[PDB]
């Protein structure tokens, strides 16, 4: 007799993951009085 058997098993299994993300809120106010006198002014970056 002469019996041979065999296996061989592989499994790969990669996974990638990439983001890149940026948000921006910009608001920007300026308001005048005349007749007295006023200015006023904002400015936000979110």
Not at 3 to 10: G, H, I, P, Q, R
Request: aromatic share 10%; charged share 25%.
């Amino acid at each position: 007799e002469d019996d041979l058997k065999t296996d061989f098993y592989k499994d790969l299994t990669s996974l990638g993951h990439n983001e890149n993300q940026q948000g921006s809120f910009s608001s920007q106010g300026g308001s005048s009085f005349s007749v007295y006198s006023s200015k006023r002014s904002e400015n936000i970056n979110h």
